Structure formats: C-alpha cells, structure tokens
Design a protein around this ligand. Structure first.
Ligand code: HEC
Ligand code: HEC
Lengths: 127, 127
C-alpha cells in the first residue's frame, strides 16, 4: 500500500536529510559560517542520499497530491532526471575528499556541488 | 536551525524509505507475496537508510511536537538506541547477501532483520 501522503513524506524527507547535511557546507563556502568540523561525513551522507533519491520518484508517485515535481521527470526527461542524481553522488564523493584536503579545496568543490541542486530544481521543481 | 515540521518530515521520511524497501521482502518471508526480483537492491538500500538514520534524532530534535520517540532515545539510553541503527545496518547488509543466495536464505535472514525493527520499536517508540 503506502498512502500517497506517506509517499510524499518519504520524498520530501529524503530532500530534507539532504538539506540538513548540505547547509553547513554551503554557508562556510558562502563566507556566512565557520567550517563544519564534520564536513567529510556530511558529504558522504549527501552521496548516500543521492543513491537512494530515485526511490522518492518511483512508479506510481507521478502525481502525488501537493507534489512539486514536473511530470517530465517521470516521462520524456526521465533519463536526464536520473542523471542529475548520479551527478550529485559523484560531486558529493569529490566533496568528501576535498573536505579532508582542507578548507580551500572544500570551498572550491562546494561551488561545483551546489550547481547540481540548482540545475535540477530549475528544470524539474515546480515551486 | 530548521522548523520542527521539516525536522520531523526528515525523521519520518527516512522511516518511510526504510518501510518501502522492507515491505515486499517481509511480505515474501511471510508467504503473502512473491519473491521480489530486486530483493538484493532493497536490502542494500535499507543498509544505507540505517547509516543515515541517526541524523533524524540529532541534538535539537529531542522534543519535536508530533514526535513519537521516547525521551530515553536522546539521553539515558542514547547508546542503546544508536546501537540498534548499527545492528539494522549489519543485518540489512547480511540480508543483501542472503537475497543473492536464494529464497530460503532470504526468508531466514529476513526473520533476523525484522527483529531489530521490533526491539527498537518496543523500547523507544510511542504508541
Ligand atoms: C534532481 C536530480 C535534484 C537534485 C540533484 C536536487 N534536488 Fe532538491 N528537489 C528535487 C525536486 C524535483 C524537488 C521537488 C519534490 C516534490 O515535492 O515533488 C526537490 C525538493 C527539494 C527540497 C524540498 C523538500 C520539501 O520539504 O519539500 C529541498 C530542501 C531540496 N530539494 C534540496 C536539495 C539540495 C540541497 C540539493 C543539492 C545538494 C538538491 N535538492 C539536489 C530534485 C532535485
Ligand atoms: C531504532 C534503533 C529503530 C529501528 C532499528 C527501526 N525503527 Fe522504526 N522507528 C523508530 C522510532 C523511534 C520511530 C518513531 C519516530 C518519531 O519520533 O516519529 C520509528 C518510526 C517508524 C515508522 C513510522 C514513520 C512515520 O511515518 O511516522 C515506520 C514505518 C518505521 N519506523 C519502520 C521501521 C522498519 C520497517 C524498521 C526495520 C527494517 C525500523 N523501523 C527499524 C526507531 C527504529
């Protein structure tokens, strides 16, 4: 089963776990916060979320009530959608390594990782 | 930071992603559904949720409204609670190996995995 509302919760829930892990790093990179001491662990977490994310968009979740994803995600642009997920896993793994190298390599790699959230939202997020 | 409704969506949506992968396999072990063709992939996904789980119970979410976890999870029995996530993660990894081995192996390791959901629930979850 799984009520539609449970399915939207799983999808936004994975997105919220992504944001919790990311924000500390986006903020340091923007000169708005101190260097998260657990940066490498957050970016590893970000890449595990990346790998699971396609479950929140599985068959039957094409038109949940209150969903915010464009239908092209499930159809004509389904492969490019999947491809954004893979890109986030790869940049997040690179972000892990750059956290262990030092604050400046983390800042350069956070810029490349944020682009991926922004690109996919521009193309596929309704709001 | 973070609004508590977003914090709870985090926590609860991780658990919905856990249930969505566990269900078909528990259903099989029970004799109520056929064997999932992707049982192995489901199980590795469960192990990744389990690694990520502790985020949903981070410091600062001890008293989210609408929260369903006993105060002991955050303090007095905090070690025991994080230990359960650990156990889930190794059981779900073993479930993935069993899936590859055959039905009889998956049924038996499924019984084993499900006990960890049960024990955690009996101690730390509210009715
Ligand atoms: C597509 C490949 C995405 C990538 C990469 C990122 N996100 Fe995104 N996110 C995506 C969509 C289609 C949606 C809409 C979901 C729906 O409701 O139907 C979202 C939503 C979010 C949210 C909102 C969750 C909520 O509570 O409603 C946030 C906080 C979010 N996304 C964050 C985020 C960040 C930080 C990313 C980069 C690390 C990122 N997402 C990548 C699609 C995609
Ligand atoms: C502790 C170490 C846990 C293990 C292992 C598992 N669960 Fe659990 N679960 C836990 C708590 C403390 C809670 C309540 C969270 C709160 O404060 O709201 C839950 C909740 C769930 C839910 C409901 C989610 C929702 O929409 O409200 C489900 C569907 C759930 N848990 C499933 C589940 C399964 C299938 C597990 C084994 C594979 C499992 N949980 C393990 C604590 C823990």
């Amino acid at each position: 089963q799984s009520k539609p509302e449970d399915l939207l919760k799983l999808r936004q829930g994975l997105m919220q776990t992504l944001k919790s892990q990311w924000v500390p790093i986006a903020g340091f990179a923007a000169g708005k916060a101190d260097l998260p001491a657990d940066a490498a662990q957050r970016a590893e977490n970000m890449a595990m979320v990346a790998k699971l994310a396609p479950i929140g968009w599985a068959k039957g979740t094409e038109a949940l009530p209150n969903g915010e994803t464009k239908p092209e995600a499930f159809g004509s642009k389904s492969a490019e959608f999947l491809e954004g997920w893979k890109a986030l896993a790869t940049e997040s793994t690179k972000l892990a390594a750059a956290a262990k190298a030092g604050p400046d390599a983390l800042k350069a790699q956070a810029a490349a990782t944020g682009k991926v959230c922004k690109a996919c939202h521009e193309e596929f997020k309704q709001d």
